[PDB]
Ligand SMILES: CCCCCCCCCCCCCCC[C@@H](C(=O)OC[C@@H]1O[C@@H](O)[C@@H](O)[C@H](O)[C@@H]1O)[C@H](O)CCCCCCCCCCCCCCCCC[C@@H]1C[C@@H]1CCCCCCCCCCCCCCCC[C@@H](OC)[C@H](C)CCCCCCCCCCCCCC
Ligand SMILES: *[C@@H]1O[C@H](CO[C@@H]2O[C@@H](C)[C@@H](O)[C@@H](O)[C@@H]2O)[C@@H](O[C@@H]2O[C@H](CO)[C@@H](O[C@@H]3O[C@H](CO[C@H]4O[C@H](CO)[C@@H](O)[C@H](O)[C@@H]4O)[C@@H](O)[C@H](O[C@H]4O[C@H](CO)[C@@H](O)[C@H](O)[C@@H]4O)[C@@H]3O)[C@H](O)[C@H]2NC(C)=O)[C@H](O[C@@H]2O[C@@H](C)[C@@H](O)[C@@H](O)[C@@H]2O)[C@H]1NC(C)=O
């Protein structure tokens with residue numbers, strides 16, 4: 001039928017205060033089929049303490065998942081969400097922009 | 099009322115080839131997950147202490163059995179008919195079924211199925227309704243399913259008798275969590291917008307529950323109807339995040355404020371004030 005590429009939105013639980021612990025969310029939505037892989041990234045390295053929701057889908061049958069990790073933003077560190085999917089030739093990287 | 103009004107189970111079944119299929123499932127109050135399905139065991143994972151509602155363990159066990167049998171048998175039967183329906187692997191089937199409490203108290207039930215991300219069928223009152231997007235496959239499917247003895251009767255009972263009392267009992271059992279009020283945090287940011295001398299102001303609103311929320315850019319009492327709302331995005335802990343943006347001419351940003359209304363604030367709106375005509379002076 002159809003194939004849809006993931007929308008990828010990265011956002012923090014609380015406003016980003018340097019030094020203050022927080023949560024980093026990656027919301028991957030609007031994709032089809034359900035097969036997907038997602039990593040959260042600290043400075044290019046896959047964060048290993050990552051939780052995610054069970055698979056769900058919206059009114060138009062497109063799938064969505066929430067990935068999240070506690071983190072502590074600094075002015076020097078970079079964070080991102082890495083997604084691969086049949087609609088992507090290479091894993092797409094979406095960096096967090098406070 | 100405040101929290102969720104709908105209970106529903108969802109199914110995602112992926113068929114890789116003629117012998118391998120995998121099914122994931124879960125149960126939800128609106129967009130709040132209260133059940134998981136464990137394919138390790140063919141039983142349900144209750145995510146909240148109250149997730150069984152007012153049902154006895156016997157009736158829960160029976161429902162788990164019905165779901166376990168359905169999930170295993172669905173994939174088997176699909177595999178067996180995949181040739182007759184001219185199916186090409188891989189393909190993916192989705193379904194959702196449940197009931198929703200409406201204003202005035204009526205509870206409406208539903209069942210919908212998809213193939214390849216497109217509508218395929220629905221149920222109206224133990225009748226299988228093929229969706230036009232499903233084409234002749236869906237017409238053939240609904241003609242076949244009515245011949246499996248007793249399955250439409252099971253569906254009808256679950257949709258129209260079991261679900262509504264489950265929904266009521268679980269909304270009552272869960273009320274301390276489902277009717278809690280959690281106050282948002284709000285903060286402002288700014289960015290360049292596409293276009294000359296323009297500027298995007300952003301009002302962030304984060305951590306609220308329940309989900310209905312009101313947020314607008316304002317000049318005094320004048321709602322700025324150019325306000326644009328993003329998606330309402332989830333946090334892990336049953337709250338959400340939302341941004342409201344406003345494209346404004348550089349030099350016209352002064353006098354703007356962001357106003358948040360939420361049931362948790364007991365009438366005391368959040369008001370953040372943008373200071374300066376441009377970026378940040
Ligand atoms: C048109 C309707 C759907 C079509 C059905 C598909 C064919 C299957 C073939 C037969 C399967 C094996 C045979 C016996 C099994 C049978 C049953 O009756 O049981 C026992 C019976 O006993 C007697 O009646 C016997 O006579 C009888 O033999 C039987 O044994 C099944 O249980 C049928 C009933 C199951 C469906 C549920 C009905 C709606 C329920 C609404 C709300 C429930 C009540 C609230 C209480 C819950 C309390 C919580 C508690 C914690 C627990 C559960 C918590 C956790 C649950 C999460 C995981 C569960 C996921 C499973 C279901 C999710 C959504 C429901 C299904 C959605 C329907 C769609 O899905 C894609 C359709 C499918 C669309 C299909 C689209 C594509 C189609 C195919 C395309 C072509 C390919 C080829 C196809 C050819 C055809 C195959
Ligand atoms: C889980 O909760 C369900 C609903 O939520 C609960 O409801 C009550 C009881 C409190 O516990 C709430 O705090 C809680 O939210 C239970 O389902 C409900 O059960 C009651 C019976 O206890 C039942 O009321 C009966 O209704 C019929 C009329 O129903 C028809 O008409 C109405 C419209 O008027 C329509 O909406 C219905 O769909 C039907 O078409 C009525 O005739 C009965 O009256 C008789 O009995 C009462 C005594 O209760 C007596 O005063 C009268 O004089 C008369 O003799 C009675 O009022 C509700 O309809 C039902 N609600 C739903 C949505 O089904 C559920 O109870 C279990 O299932 C029921 C169907 C019933 O078989 C009960 O015996 C069961 O225990 C409960 N438990 C489970 C396991 O689901």
Ligand SMILES: *[C@@H]1O[C@H](CO)[C@@H](O)[C@H](O)[C@H]1NC(C)=O
Nearest residue numbers: 207222223224254257258259
């Ligand atoms: C289903 O159809 C019957 C008529 O056979 C009707 O009485 C009933 O209200 C309909 N809806 C149901 C059972 O949910």
Ligand SMILES: [Cl-]
Nearest residue numbers: 284285286370
């Ligand atoms: Cl601020």
